[PDB]
Every structure is written in structure tokens, then in C-alpha cells.
């Protein structure tokens, strides 16, 4: 009354209490947040502002 | 003859001791009451006894 | 230059709180002492934190000594009587006597007087301990006399220090059993040697120490296999010494703090013997500090330390920092025989039976000879029959 | 002030008593102190004292509070320049007095405890039996450090400090060598007692107190028994040079 | 409906305890401020818990600043003078000046006034800290000005936080030695790189951070083999920065509680550099929490952190959560040579001798070059002879 | 006695001194060599 949404974070999934996971209460889904691929790196550099001093080709490189 | 800094002199009712007026009156009345019922003289052996054993008896 | 507060005080507002009652009592205590003794006592401590000579006062009053005289009660309706009985002490004292609180006492030859002045606060009854004297020279001689009185009184007692979580607990105990030197059952050659130190330290004139320029202290370690009666021996040695004896009980609460408390408290009874049984039971993190109190740059005098250990290895890693370490083995035949006469085998055995029983008890500890005594005693007291040869052979097997 | 009064020193001068019926005399005797002092003298509580030549006076004004007896410690001066000069003279005075005391810091549960004792048995240098060239050099570095001038340490911007470590099997004159120093040098000597309560908090208190005594000698017996979780902190404290 | 208590109060019994004295003092403080400045000051804090600007007041009075004016004493017979001298601080201050307690001060241009009103209780002398202002706009501008004054003052000082059992202890220290950038002996290429961040963060306009949308904070880790002088380097870098410097001394008392205290106290001096030496000495149970304060969802701005470690392995397990980690190796020949000119070898050696000594000191730490300096100095100061080639060859062996 | 005490510390020589002195003071002779052996014992 009415609803807690929990978000847990870890850089060490191995050290997690396994009781936490795959229950509807507690944490029912887990997602891996991994290193960005090239398309995502290029996306990050643009929004970050590398375009202020880098050309469209320098950023792609 | 070394001087005294404090020279105020005390009126006689400034010597009264805090709380003794109530306490001594009570003790006195308890002694008179005990005398009225038993004809013997009781006095104080402890004004605030810390022993608990015979008090719990 | 300006002043914010410009209110002008009536002279009645200059009065000091509490002083009107207190100054009145002090004046009356002095008037009363003059009326009785014809001299002028002066205040030397208005609420004395010292407890030593105040405890001497109470014991003097309690024990009916002639020296302290009851001079006056303070408040007519507070206690005029009290009693020693405190349910928290091991040995109750049922003595009834004149109160200390609410009283004025004087040591008229000494020129020193005492008043424990009651007052009410939060919400109990407390007191100001007030000390008076006729002049500075008498006050000083009284103070100088405190320690020698405490010393004489503690000869007649044994003081146990038990270390606890807050600090050490001091406990005085009656010398119910006096111990003659002939009851110390021990290797004769080493008994002789130890008592050379003891007799010089406690039972002689102290000039020896100044003549040879020898620090006035000693520390000996008594060690050996378990069950060799080391503890009963040290108590027996301690009981033969005409000086206060203090026992220090190491516990799991022993720290470098309890150590300093105990040594400062024993040192107040100097010269005193300080018994430390199973010094190997003390925590390893204070042992470096402990051995420094006995031999460091700021170690002090007046104490004859006697410790016992089963693990000489762990106490004095230099084995050496005690003055001497003596091994107490199991008793040989003549020691076993002294033991049996002292413990009372002669009650139920002939001399031949004792001599024989000493001979058959090879390898027996003092404890085992004791357990033999109790078990052999029942039989003689139950069956009219002792059966020692049967009982030694049965106890060995 | 108390020690000046207790010892019969010429200043301060007793000026007045405050309350006619509070104590006029006291005595130094404190049963919770290892050295019993039996001196009787004029009371501090309930008195006014003046140092006429310094222009500073003292009154320990008694009052009653929750039954018990307390005091305000009131300080008076003739003017600001007298007050400052008096304050500026305090640590040179304590310095001198500490030459004729030994200071011992003993680490307890809260923190360290300071006690000023006189040595139970004094020890001259001639009673230290040792290889003469070892003796000579150990005494020479100590004696050079306090009585040569610091022309060296200022010229080369070198912090004015030194430490030597004495080691060997026990009972061969280390303690005796140390005790020979208190009598023998014109500077205070302090001993630091490491205990199981020794902490970084304990190390700070000691060096702050020791540096207030400087120039002085600081003795650390059994430096091996310093606990492991404070050793690094101890090294940092040594480095932080108050010269 | 009935009322048990039916007693009817005299109007004299409506009076509020303590208010008659206090309201009278406040009225008089206001009357006196009007008489002197011609404006009306109002109470804004009757017993102000804030200490920051009250400490600025005291330092202003102590240092003879013109800005705060002494307006009045409160009680004619309480102190009118005081002194800074407190025996508990490392550096004594002997300044004598007008009292703060028992005084009224005003910052008349600022429109803010201060009164520390004495009173007696249990049993000491305490005070109400009272803050006055002529209107709300001046009061606010005064508060807004506190932090910039504290900032300027702490540029001129170094603040050490030492973690203890209760909490962290703040200690301000004089900048006895100023440090020019040319005295930072360090790899030149990496010196250049670090100072790009430092100069932007501290010695430029802050618009850079808004132009590129870059968080205004930094954390760098300095690591390397022991004895490489990492600590002397970080102090040298810190001393070249025109901003308050704070040192955080991890102890065995460091917890997640001291961490938050230290970071909140440093953050009050923002922008500030915060030095953390041997971050590897901190307890392993707070390290997860610690790295979160630098990069977590609620990490804050304004601090330039500089840590040192010998075990980069243990601090930042991702080795990475500091912004950059720089290795400080042993000095090569040109660094050894800069060191020797800065430390003062040129006192007793020719330039050829320095160049040579830099050349022979391969593998030397900065500490070792230092220990070489002291030992070589005595000889030149003792024997008129330095003998460096002999001393380097003897120190290597 | 200096020869017989090879390997002694000063503190040990001091314990030797107290023990001899006690013997001398109480009985009129010192027994110095016995005590040296007692202490190696």
C-alpha cells in the first residue's frame, strides 16, 4: 500500500545472496549492463560533446 | 588579621537548613506516635537505609 | 564603555547561596570544640575527598577505641546511632555505635576533629566531610600517622584484589588461621634460601639495604608441574610474614589499568608481600607492560612479589626478569612425612604407620596426600578402620 | 600557583580570604597519588593571591552547588601587557620545573595519563658499565644535541631532531643507561609507556605533550610492543617535525 | 465538564521564569545599538547554535580588524578582557583583547550585531549567543558572506582531519613554507598533465566546466614502489594551489562515519584539494562505501581528491574508479639533479660535483638522496670535507 | 668471581650481589662460588 519498486546494483553478481533472485517479491529479473559496442560509444561521444572540437570523421575514428 | 572579601552578615533565618524542617518534624511526630502506642522511646538508626533485605521482609 | 545591565542590587542580594547554613554550622562546631577542649579548631578541608583516615575514624568509633571522642550531634532529629551491618560485604558486622554522619568527633591529643555534616539533595541524604585541627603542625603529624596505622591494621588481615570490568575490587579478610614457619612444607635448602630474603625484608632492621646499596624490593617466581601445591605453599609462606599480605587475582578483566591500580594499592601497604598466583593466566597483551613495572626505568620499591606458574616458559621469556625462579617438585619421602604429621594423620595412625605411609607414597602430590587423608579419615571415622596400605595401593592404580 | 604556594616561594603573596568560615588552610596530601605530600599551607580555594612583580592575581572563589562545594577560578591582571607577559612566561617556567621531574605518559582506555615523579633510585653516568667508546659516543650525541648550537640545522634546513635505538638482551644496562640521563642533562626527560590501549589517538597526545617540553629527551621503552595498527601513524607523527 | 484544579492565579504568578532578566538585556542591547548607530537592531537568534561566523567574530576581534566595533559590556563586573591562550592547542596564541563573552559587537556596515550574554548555571558560567540585524536583507547578505570569508582564510592554512574514536578532529596549521610550482620534483610530462586539471579547477575561471558540461570534481591516485617520496610530492603539489588544502589522516578509527564527516567538512571549503595519504591503510569494511562517495548516485562536487598508495591492487579493485592513476617511479638522472639543487647540495659542491652525484645515484630514492644530503652535510660541516663519491659508494653497499 | 661469571648479565651479577651480601650479613661468610653454581643451576 502501495508498492515498493526495488532496484539493486552490484559490480559483483557472484557475491549476491542467491535468495534475492528469481522470486516475484525480491528481485525477479536481472539485467547485465556491459561495455558499450562501437555504435553506442559513438552515440555517447556525440551527446557528451566531442563534436565541439572533433570533426565528424575524427569522432567516428 | 587577614581581610575577608565577603562581608555580608546573615540574618538568623538564613541559617535554616534545606529540607530539615520537614524531615525533623516528621521524625519527631513518628517518635511521639510510637511513644503514644507503646510507651517506649524509639530513635533513628538509619535515616535512609540502603539495606534492602529486612525491608523486603 | 556603556553597561547593558543597570539594575542595582539590594544588599540582601549579595548573599551567597548555601553559605548561611554552612558558615553557621562551622562556627558552632568551632564554638562547641572550644567549650569542651579549650582550644580553637580551624577548618582544613570543607568536603574532604580523602577516605583513608575517615575510614580509620569509623573503625575507631566502631571498635570502642578510647582515642576518638564524641563531641556533639549536628541535627537533633537526624540519626544519633548507626550500625556497621551492610548486606553487600562477605562478612557482616553487627556492631551498633554512635553515628558518624550527624556527629562531631575529636582526637584531642592529636588536635584533629571530624564532622560529617548531613544535607538533603536529589533526593538522598548526603554529607560534607569536614576536617578541623588546632594548628598546622598537629594537622601534619596526624596525616603522617595515617599510613603507619593502616600498616599495623593490615598486618592483621589479608587483602584480595580481584580484577573486574570497571577496575579492581579490594576485599579485606580476617586471618582466621595463623601460620608458623614450621608449617611451610618445602625443600629445606630452598626454604632456607628464600627466608634469607624474607627475614631481611620484613623481620629485620632496614639498614641492610642502605649498607650494601641494594634496591628494597624483590620478585621471585615459583614454578613446577601441576598439582605440586604451589598455591598452598605461597599462602603458607605469606602467612608466616609479619607484614600485610595482598593477593592479586588475575582474571579475564586484567589489563594494564588493573595492574597499575593493584600495584599502587599494594604499595600503600609497603612493606608488603604481594602474591600473584598463576601469573600465566594473564592476557598476553599486558605481559610486556607487566614485566616493566617490576624492572623498568620507573619501577618502584617496597614490594616483595611472589608469583606461581605452571608454564615458566610463558611468563618470563628470558628463562630472566624476576630475581629468582625456584622449581617446586613433588615431595620426596621426608617432605611427605612432614606433611602427614602437619595434616593430622597421627590422629589415626601410629608413628610406624606414618613412616610407612610416607615410604609408600612415592610420586604422590600434596593434593593426593590430602585426598588420601580425607578418604582415610572417613574409614577410621566410619569403620574404625583406616586401611591406608590398601588405600594407597588403590589410589595409585 | 599551587606549587609556588606549597613550596613557600616568595611570590605569590596571600592577599585575603574570601569567606570567613570556609577553609583557610589545606594540605597537599592526596591518597590517590603515588608520592604523598604532607605539606600544610594556606588554602587555594577561598583565597586571593597576587604576584605583585608580574601584575597578575588569582582568586579561587568558592560556591555551593547541588550540595557540593565548587569554585570559580578568577584571573586578574593590572593591564594587557602584564597579562600577556605572564602568559608568555608559563612554558619556560614549566620547562625549568620539568628538568627536576621525570614525566611518564601511560596509555589508558580513554587516553594517556601524565605523572611527574622523581626517580626512585638516581643513577650517575659513572655507574653505567659499558664499553667506554660506546658510552662516550652515546653521551656525546645527547650532549651535542642540547648544548652545541643549532648552527648546523638552520644552515642546512635540516629538522632539529635525532633518535637512537638501544637494543640487546635484557639486564645489561639499557635501563641503567636511560636512567643516567635524567640527572645528567639540562633538559627534561619524558618516558612513554606503550600499553594495549596505545592508539593513534594516544600517539598524538604524547608527542603534543612531549613537544611542549622541547628541548627534551623522549624515551620509549620496548618500542617493539607498539601495536601493528598504529605503527604507520607513529611513523607519520615522527616525520611531522616541530623543531 | 468539571475542573479538579480551581485555584485562582494572582496576576504575579503569570510571569515567565528567566524572561524578566533576558527581555531586559535584549531591550537594553537594542537601546544601546540605537544610541550609537541610529538604527534599530532586531533579534534573529536568541541562542545561536551556529559557530562559523561566531568564530569569524572572535578572530576579527583578536586580530585587531577594523570591521567589528565593541559597543558595550553587559555586566560591569564580569570580564572586559580575555586572551586567546588555550593550553590544549598545538600552537599557543598569546593575544590579549576585549572579551567576547560579556560584550556586544556590531558590524555597522553589515548591519549585524553580536552579544554573548553571560549567566550562571551548574555551576559554571555559560552564555546565550544572540544575533541581531537591522533588517532581513542585511541578515541574509551577512550569512551569504560567511563561506567566502572562511574560504579566503583557509587558503592561508592547512587543515588536518585525524579520525578518532568519537569522530574526526579538525586542526588548522600555519603555512610556514610556501611551495612554488618549480619545486615539485616529478616526471615533467606527467606534471604537465596533472596541472592541466589543477589549473583549470583552481586557477582559472570556472566557466570551462559549464561550457563542456563536465562535473566539477576530480580524483587522482598516485602510486608506486615504497620510498619514492609520494607523500612529500602530494604535499608539494598541494602547497602550489591557491585554495584551502585539507589533509585526511586515516587511522584505525576510520569508519563510514568519519568519512562522511571529513568530506562534509572539506566540502565546506570547496573548491579545496583533499589529500588522502596511504588510502590503503583504511579498513576493508568501509572501502566499498568510500568509493561510492566519489562516484555513487549521490556523490558531490567541489573537491579535488589526491590519494597515495603503495598497493594500487587493494584500493581501486578495477585496476578503475578514480579518474586517473599515475605511477611515481624512482627518479631518473635529471630528476635526481633537480632534487639536489632544490635540497641544497650546491652549498658544498661545485656544479660538476652535482652533475656527477646525480650520475652516480642510479637507483636512489628521494629519501636516500635526502639521507645522503644530511650525512654529507655533517662531514662538510664537521671535517670541511664532503666525500660524496665515497659516501654514495658506501651507501649503495 | 669475574672469571667464574662468564656469560652473566649485569642484572645477574646484581642478583649475585644481593645473595652474597645476605649470606655475609647474616652468617659471616659469603659462599660466593656456591652461589655462582646455584645460579647456573
Swiss-Prot record, chain A:
From the UniProt record, report the name of the gene that encodes this protein: yjoB
Task: Please give the function described in this protein's UniProt entry.
Answer: Shows ATPase activity.
| Locations listed in the record | Cytoplasm
State what protein this is by name: Uncharacterized ATPase YjoB
Q: Which organism is it from?
A: Bacillus subtilis (strain 168)
**Similarity field:** Belongs to the AAA ATPase family.
Q: What induces it?
A: Expression is sigma W-dependent. Induced by alkali stress. Strongly induced at the end of the exponential growth phase.
Q: Name the domain of life.
A: Bacteria
Swiss-Prot record, chains C, E:
Superkingdom per UniProt: Bacteria
The kind of enzyme this is, by top-level EC class, is hydrolase
Q: What triggers its expression?
A: Expression is sigma W-dependent. Induced by alkali stress. Strongly induced at the end of the exponential growth phase.
- Transmembrane helix as a keyword of this entry, yes or no, is no
- Binding positions for ATP per the UniProt entry: 224-231
Q: What InterPro entries does the entry give?
A: AAA+_ATPase, AAA_ATPase_domain, ATPase_AAA_core, P-loop_NTPase
- The UniProt entry lists the main location of this chain as cytoplasm
EC number in record: 3.-.-.-
The keyword ATP-binding is assigned to this record: yes
Source taxonomy: Bacteria, Bacillati, Bacillota, Bacilli, Bacillales
| Signal peptide boundaries | none
For this UniProt entry, the molecular function terms from Gene Ontology, in alphabetical order, are:
ATP binding; ATP hydrolysis activity
Subcellular localization, per the record? Cytoplasm
Q: Which Pfam families match?
A: AAA
Q: Which UniProt keywords apply?
A: ATP-binding, Cytoplasm, Hydrolase, Nucleotide-binding
Role this protein plays: Shows ATPase activity.
The name on file for this protein is Uncharacterized ATPase YjoB
Q: Record's family?
A: Belongs to the AAA ATPase family.
Classification via SUPFAM superfamilies? P-loop containing nucleoside triphosphate hydrolases (SSF52540)
GO cellular component terms listed in the entry, alphabetical order: cytoplasm
Amino acid at each position: 500500500k502501495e508498492g515498493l519498486f526495488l532496484i539493486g546494483t552490484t559490480n559483483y553478481p557472484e557475491e549476491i545472496d542467491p535468495g534475492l533472485m528469481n522470486r516475484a517479491g525480491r528481485f525477479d529479473r536481472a539485467y547485465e549492463i556491459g561495455l558499450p559496442d562501437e555504435e553506442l560509444r559513438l552515440e555517447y561521444m556525440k551527446m557528451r560533446g566531442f563534436g565541439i572540437f572533433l570533426s565528424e570523421g575524427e569522432i567516428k575514428n | 588579621n587577614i581581610p575577608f572579601i565577603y562581608q555580608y552578615e546573615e540574618k538568623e533565618n538564613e541559617r535554616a537548613a534545606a529540607g530539615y524542617g520537614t524531615f525533623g518534624y516528621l521524625i519527631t511526630r513518628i517518635e511521639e506516635t510510637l511513644y503514644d502506642q507503646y510507651g517506649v522511646f524509639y530513635e533513628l538508626y538509619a535515616s535512609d537505609d540502603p539495606n534492602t533485605e529486612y525491608w523486603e521482609l | 564603555i556603556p553597561f547593558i545591565y543597570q539594575y542595582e542590587e539590594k544588599e540582601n542580594e549579595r548573599a551567597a547561596a548555601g553559605y548561611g547554613t554552612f558558615g553557621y554550622l562551622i562556627t558552632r562546631i568551632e564554638e562547641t570544640l572550644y567549650d569542651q577542649y579549650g582550644v580553637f579548631y580551624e577548618l582544613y578541608a570543607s568536603d574532604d575527598p580523602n577516605t583513608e583516615y575517615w575510614e580509620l575514624l569509623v573503625e575507631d568509633v566502631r571498635s570502642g577505641s578510647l582515642e576518638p571522642e564524641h563531641v556533639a550531634y549536628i541535627f537533633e532529629k537526624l540519626e544519633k546511632k548507626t550500625f556497621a551491618y551492610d548486606e553487600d560485604e562477605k562478612e557482616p558486622d553487627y556492631t551498633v555505635h554512635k553515628s558518624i554522619r550527624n556527629s562531631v568527633y575529636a582526637y584531642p591529643e592529636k588536635g584533629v576533629a571530624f564532622a560529617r555534616i548531613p544535607y538533603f539533595q536529589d533526593g538522598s541524604i548526603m554529607s560534607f566531610d569536614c576536617l578541623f585541627a588546632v594548628n598546622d603542625e598537629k594537622m601534619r603529624a596526624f596525616l603522617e600517622g595515617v599510613r603507619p596505622r593502616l600498616w599495623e591494621k593490615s598486618k592483621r588481615k589479608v587483602t584480595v584484589f580481584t580484577d573486574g570490568d570497571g577496575g579492581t575490587s579490594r576485599e579485606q579478610e580476617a586471618i582466621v588461621r595463623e601460620v608458623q614457619r614450621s608449617q611451610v612444607i618445602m625443600n629445606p635448602l630452598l626454604k632456607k634460601e628464600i627466608y634469607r630474603s624474607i627475614d631481611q625484608f620484613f623481620h629485620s632492621d632496614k639498614s641492610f639495604y642502605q649498607t650494601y646499596d641494594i634496591p628494597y624490593k624483590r620478585g621471585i617466581l615459583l614454578y613446577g608441574p601441576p598439582g605440586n601445591g604451589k598455591t598452598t605453599l605461597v599462602k603458607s609462606i605469606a602467612g608466616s610474614i609479619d607484614a600485610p599480605v595482598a593477593y592479586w587475582q588475575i582474571t579475564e578483566f586484567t589489563s594494564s589499568e588493573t595492574i597499575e591500580e593493584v600495584f599502587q594499592a599494594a604499595r600503600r601497604l609497603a612493606p608488603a608481600v604481594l602474591v600473584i598466583e598463576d601469573i600465566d593466566s594473564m592476557p598476553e597483551d599486558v605481559r610486556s607492560f607487566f614485566l616493566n613495572t617490576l624492572d623498568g626505568a620507573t619501577s618502584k620499591e617496597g614490594l616483595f612479589l611472589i608469583g606461581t606458574t605452571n608454564y615458566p616458559e610463558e611468563i618470563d621469556p628470558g628463562l630472566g626478569r624476576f630475581d629468582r625462579a625456584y622449581e617446586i617438585g613433588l615431595p620426596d619421602e621426608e617432605l611427605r612425612l612432614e606433611y602427614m604429621k602437619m595434616r593430622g594423620f597421627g590422629i589415626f595412625l601410629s608413628e610406624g604407620e606414618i613412616k610407612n605411609a610416607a615410604k609408600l607414597t612415592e610420586g604422590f602430590s600434596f593434593a593426593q596426600l590430602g585426598e588420601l587423608y580425607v578418604s582415610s579419615a572417613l574409614q577410621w571415622h566410619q569403620e574404625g578402620n583406616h586401611h591406608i596400605e590398601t588405600m594407597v595401593k588403590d589410589m595409585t592404580g
